[PDB]
Design an enzyme around this catalytic site. Sequence first.
Site, PDB file in Angstrom:
ATOM      1  N   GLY A  52       0.647  -1.050   0.033  1.00 30.15           N
ATOM      2  CA  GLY A  52       0.127  -0.046   0.056  1.00 30.15           C
ATOM      3  C   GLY A  52       0.655   1.279   0.126  1.00 30.15           C
ATOM      4  O   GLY A  52       2.107   1.266  -0.373  1.00 30.15           O
TER       5      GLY A  52
ATOM      6  N   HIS B 217       5.735  -5.685   0.944  1.00 34.82           N
ATOM      7  CA  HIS B 217       6.138  -4.356   0.114  1.00 34.82           C
ATOM      8  C   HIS B 217       6.769  -3.422   0.976  1.00 34.82           C
ATOM      9  O   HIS B 217       6.131  -2.469   1.828  1.00 34.82           O
ATOM     10  CB  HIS B 217       5.115  -3.902  -0.907  1.00 34.82           C
ATOM     11  CG  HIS B 217       5.439  -2.577  -1.323  1.00 34.82           C
ATOM     12  ND1 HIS B 217       5.373  -1.308  -0.608  1.00 34.82           N
ATOM     13  CD2 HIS B 217       5.861  -1.975  -2.667  1.00 34.82           C
ATOM     14  CE1 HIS B 217       5.628  -0.309  -1.371  1.00 34.82           C
ATOM     15  NE2 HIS B 217       6.060  -0.619  -2.442  1.00 34.82           N
TER      16      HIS B 217
ATOM     17  N   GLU C 196       9.895   1.125  -0.130  1.00 34.65           N
ATOM     18  CA  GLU C 196       9.858   1.693  -1.755  1.00 34.65           C
ATOM     19  C   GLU C 196      10.589   2.915  -1.717  1.00 34.65           C
ATOM     20  O   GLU C 196      11.404   3.363  -2.520  1.00 34.65           O
ATOM     21  CB  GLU C 196       8.348   1.675  -2.251  1.00 34.65           C
ATOM     22  CG  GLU C 196       8.297   2.443  -3.661  1.00 34.65           C
ATOM     23  CD  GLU C 196       8.815   1.892  -4.623  1.00 34.65           C
ATOM     24  OE1 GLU C 196       8.668   0.912  -4.784  1.00 34.65           O
ATOM     25  OE2 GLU C 196       9.468   2.795  -5.461  1.00 34.65           O
TER      26      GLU C 196
ATOM     27  N   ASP D 115       5.328  -6.551 -12.073  1.00 33.54           N
ATOM     28  CA  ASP D 115       4.664  -5.640 -11.550  1.00 33.54           C
ATOM     29  C   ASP D 115       2.951  -5.617 -12.096  1.00 33.54           C
ATOM     30  O   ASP D 115       2.285  -6.712 -12.247  1.00 33.54           O
ATOM     31  CB  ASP D 115       5.089  -4.307 -11.364  1.00 33.54           C
ATOM     32  CG  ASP D 115       4.201  -3.663 -10.057  1.00 33.54           C
ATOM     33  OD1 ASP D 115       3.670  -4.192  -9.044  1.00 33.54           O
ATOM     34  OD2 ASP D 115       4.342  -2.430  -9.854  1.00 33.54           O
TER      35      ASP D 115
END
Lengths: 581, 590
Positions: free
Chosen positions: B410, B438, B441, B523
């Site tokens: 998210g 995740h 990033e 992705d």
Amino acid sequence: RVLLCSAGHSSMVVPEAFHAVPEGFEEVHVFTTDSEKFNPVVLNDFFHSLPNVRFSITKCHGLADILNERDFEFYQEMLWQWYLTKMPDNELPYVCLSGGIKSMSASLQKAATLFGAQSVFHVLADNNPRNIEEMFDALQKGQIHFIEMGYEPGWAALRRLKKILPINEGCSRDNFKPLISKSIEEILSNVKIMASDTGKSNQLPFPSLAILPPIAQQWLQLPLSANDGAWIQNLPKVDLHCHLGGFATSGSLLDQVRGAAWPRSHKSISLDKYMELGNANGSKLLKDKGCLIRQVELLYQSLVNDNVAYAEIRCSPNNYADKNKNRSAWVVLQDINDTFTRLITEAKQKNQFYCHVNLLVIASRKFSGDLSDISKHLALAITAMQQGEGVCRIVGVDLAGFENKETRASYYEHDFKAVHRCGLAVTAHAGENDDPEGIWQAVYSLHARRLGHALNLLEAPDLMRTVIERKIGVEMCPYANYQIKGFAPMPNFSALYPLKKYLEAGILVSVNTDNIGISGANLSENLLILADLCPGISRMDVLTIIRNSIETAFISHDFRMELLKFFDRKIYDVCLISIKN
Amino acid sequence: RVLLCSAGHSSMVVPEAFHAVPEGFEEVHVFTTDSEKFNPVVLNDFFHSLPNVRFSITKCHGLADILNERDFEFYQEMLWQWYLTKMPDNELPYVCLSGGIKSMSASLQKAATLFGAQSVFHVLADNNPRNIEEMFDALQKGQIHFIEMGYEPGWAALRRLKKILPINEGCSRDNFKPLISKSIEEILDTGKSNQLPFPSLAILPPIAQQWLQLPLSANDGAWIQNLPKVDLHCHLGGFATSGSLLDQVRGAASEPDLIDRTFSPQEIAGWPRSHKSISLDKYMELGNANGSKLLKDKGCLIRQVELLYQSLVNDNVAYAEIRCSPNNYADKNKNRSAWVVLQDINDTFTRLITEAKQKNQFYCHVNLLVIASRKFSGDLSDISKHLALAITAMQQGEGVCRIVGVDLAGFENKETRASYYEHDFKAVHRCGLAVTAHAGENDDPEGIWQAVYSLHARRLGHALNLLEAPDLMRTVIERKIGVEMCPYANYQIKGFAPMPNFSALYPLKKYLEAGILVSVNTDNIGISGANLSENLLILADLCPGISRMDVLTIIRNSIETAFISHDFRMELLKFFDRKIYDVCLISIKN
Ligand SMILES: Nc1ncnc2c1ncn2[C@@H]1O[C@H](COP(=O)(O)OP(=O)(O)OP(=O)(O)O)[C@@H](O)[C@H]1O
Ligand SMILES: [Mg+2]
Ligand SMILES: [Mg+2]
């Protein structure tokens, strides 16, 4: 740099090829047949004019020329053997082909292609010279010409055939054997099998020793026999769980250590009978320095003797410290590291096979007594791994000790919040008498990268899947559980060793010595007991065990790559040697 | 069969080799220099007695004999061209070396060991006959010997130069590029020495075995497409976003009345090769035409899943894991619960897998990853709902297209570092699922530590800033934690070389050298506009100096870090080994 060239009837090639490179060469070897037509005088005196370079002459005994199939095959075998035995150890050599008749030229080119060469070349002269002064004259006028074919890389798996036979002390026709023919047939059979079938063509699940002869692979697939002791001893091995203080507990080792200041028993025992048996050494004896140094040297010599290429040692620095002598635990650990790195450097300088050893700081589960000891040991390990310089270092800690429900992994977990922070590693000892919940929390709370024993994983399929998917290693020592529990058709003990089932499941199993002295058996014997103790075990699973051991070690990435390369080369060489006998 | 021969002073060694096989030979083609010592008339008379045997004669025009470097190289290139022109289409030619001086014999032997030959051999006679009535009794007495050193498979697939380089019988040395010289000059580090996965790569001939170590170039598109690959970070909702795929999925809707055909994402110049860096918000807005606003329809979902699977099979993928959000596609109005949507996806994928396997075609085994998103606009109970749904789908048990684990992803604006959502992840590991994350990033390298040591995440999404935390990189490598990375997506949304006004370098090469189990993924296929093959190929101009063996070890790493059982991993490894061996043998035959 080495020059290899064939000699036929005339001496054109050797000098012109020698000077063909502007820098010149250092060693030059020439191959020739038993023909008396050739003369060795001109080359001998020319190379004696420059003694700084090396020179030699090899003659194919009992063969003046090639007259039939047998003559040609024997000449090709002798040429291949000479090329193999004159192979430079590291770098590829140079080859000149213009010598001999076309058959020698083709055989030499095939040899260069198979075994690899730096830069093969041709030499041709228009005037067909005869004697040194006018070779030099024609070279000065520029009539010399070098024709370069290319740079053959060769089969890297073929160069490793020097181990089986450097030379057969001048083999005769009565006892002649075509070994290089065996090499060519094994490579052609492997390629043809690859290109023909699909099943065996795709199976290939292992470290790229697949260039082994098909007969060798079939022998490997056969179940391991009790008579493979010589082969397994010749096999390089890894011991990821060894205790330093339990070496000199029996035999002359204890007497030697004191002066330098079984194992197939069928008795089922439950602890304290190794502790009291080994009480002659360790805490009571190793308080001084000479005893500790002698013990370290003896352990390293024993490790090198069994061809072990890597090992991790668990020691107890606090058990050896002497405050009255101003011998702190840190000083003891520094002494251990220093003697181990000195031994490793000494062995490496001799270029002989050496055993890299890393240290693991134990954290004895003393329970109620001196609760601060766990924190002291953890901090000692954390600050000791930071010395940096040294081939031997500290790579992790240990959680062995008195195992109990109260002593579960959720009891010391308050003190481990920084061991992983500083980059250490954690092993554990559980499952011998504990609960699968304890093993689960040890896997998930302490983040234990490895695990000790836990022979009852089969009863917990969920925990088995958890350990398998997370690639958590298992250190299980066959002699230890043989002496503790009932295995190897133990009377009145129908329990069977789960090593076979562990291997089928996919658990990264490592076989270790635990303690060499009290058990009275080394790692080689530990591997042999798997034959009768675990029926139907194949020789390939032993190599799988070795691969798992070197995969579950607390080592750096680059060091792992180096160890993998060395192990691949050694396994290839030893298998290729041992298949013949 | 076709036999090839070359000779010098000797005139008719070819008839001597014509009796090497007792059954006989079918075609004879002789190539030799322009020297006059070779007699063509004798061979013509010999082969005129056998009309059934074709006899073609060619000579090295303009070159009587080899005398220097230029003559030798001209003869070598002409001989190579004649060899790859005259070889049989499906069978390796026959060749003999009983004649010719050292130069031509060596050149032809080296040519034979490169492409291949059915059998190279030597024929020598004790009495060296001059005329045919002599070699007749020479062979009758057995004096003539069929000296044969061994079968020469060569490179079983190298002859593509017959067509990729046009056949030009009439030409000179003025125009020739020795591609073999480039593929041979530099062959012989620990990394490329022992980092080879897929053991069968060792079986390959040395020319290819070293070819795999050359730097990757943009011209290897066919080879890189032909390999079996693995995709682990693929989003189902971002598959079809524009063009024919969007038209098809829109047309497959149950009710086309309420399909918004007016919206269209804006174009970006040079996409996927963006002319400048882009933000995450615009990147997601590019996928606004699809997602959940259109996937509510059951027919739309079925069409999207089938099209995604077809694209996966087309891209030669052999295994994939699909990230999906079952709750986002749920609608209580039509009794379309999230569990029903997930079950329907599972049955559709299982049916596709079974129907592809029954026909013995190429199929990509596919497993689903549920997404426990950051849950914008609050309402964090959806995390618990997603976890419960994932667990229930997990012990559903029977089937082929199973559920492997959960995924946490998210926005990074909320500053979630695996601690806000840790309160519920404990129960997942007891069942036996797997957790990704995740992480990092564009955030600090602290939260990655929590994601690794508390969430027990076995994979890390992106994590492009790992190079600035060596202490974190050490434990990432030491714990065998996979790092999924998407080249095109990260390049578009962050910017990397060689995009002007940028200095940051893509850390894939350093990640591989360090030893992180990095796997390259795609992705969002539709939004980024690039499948797995293009993503893997962009590494040529993204990370300079990357080698083909590095790509193969990347595929091996993707095999390693995927959440699969041990036995299935073994079967997948065997199949990948065989397939990749065949690809490196046949596709780079160019
Ligand atoms: N990580 C290592 N562990 C153990 N030995 C190593 C390691 N790295 C290098 N060596 C040593 O490098 C040496 C290289 O030897 P080489 O390749 O010439 O084979 P050899 O001398 O014919 O036989 P041997 O391998 O037994 O020495 C080996 O002896 C090996 O002991
Ligand atoms: Mg022990
Ligand atoms: Mg994503």
